[PDB]
Design a protein around this motif. Structure first.
Motif: not given
Ligand SMILES: *[C@@H]1O[C@H](CO)[C@@H](O[C@@H]2O[C@H](CO)[C@@H](O[C@@H]3O[C@H](CO)[C@@H](O)[C@H](O)[C@@H]3O)[C@H](O)[C@H]2NC(C)=O)[C@H](O)[C@H]1NC(C)=O
Lengths: 50, 84
Positions: B5-32
């Motif tokens: 229960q608290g406060f936060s923010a963000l910050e822009p870094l990079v302009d990415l002129p994509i121009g196409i829709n996005i469907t899905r996303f997936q993460t990257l870890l390394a365990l076991h």
């Protein structure tokens, strides 16, 4: 050598350095900061910036 | 731990002129015990943004979460006294 300007709907920020000159201090003038204008007293200003 | 229960923010870094829709996303870890990365969504809504002398965010309230949400949304304040 071929220079092609690909102006699609994509944002236009790859641009040219137009007229960056000495800052006009204490002379009532407008300004052109990449697209914004206004009659400004453009000098060193007393505020914090982020 | 949890999303506190608290406060936060963000910050822009990079302009990415994509121009196409996005469907899905997936993460990257390394365990076991409760650690987890939380993913919900973002919605076409509108919020309230209160700012300080330094120029930093302090409080925030939605417009369409509840009656209080639109109350702060239109009354243009965070105190917002009683009434209709
Ligand atoms: C908001 O803007 C102010 C304006 O400068 C920032 O104030 C600075 O705050 C830091 C700590 O937050 C101060 O450091 C402290 O300095 C004193 C001595 O001055 C020392 O005794 C403390 O232990 C600490 O190191 C800093 O001095 C202060 N600036 C000035 C000019 O005094 C503040 O950080 C900004 N906050 C945000 C969130 O941007």
């Amino acid at each position: 050598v071929v220079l092609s300007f690909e102006l699609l709907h994509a944002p236009a920020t790859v641009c040219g350095p137009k007229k960056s000159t000495n800052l006009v201090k204490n002379k009532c003038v407008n300004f052109n900061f990449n697209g914004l204008t206004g009659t400004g007293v453009l000098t060193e200003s007393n505020k914090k910036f982020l | 731990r949890d999303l506190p229960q608290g406060f936060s923010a963000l910050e822009p870094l990079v302009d990415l002129p994509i121009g196409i829709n996005i469907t899905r996303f997936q993460t990257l870890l390394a365990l076991h015990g409760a650690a987890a990365y939380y993913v919900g969504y973002l919605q076409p809504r509108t919020f309230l943004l209160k700012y300080n002398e330094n120029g930093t965010i302090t409080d925030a309230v939605d417009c369409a979460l509840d009656p209080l949400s639109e109350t702060k949304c239109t009354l243009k304040s965070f105190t917002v006294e009683k009434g209709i």
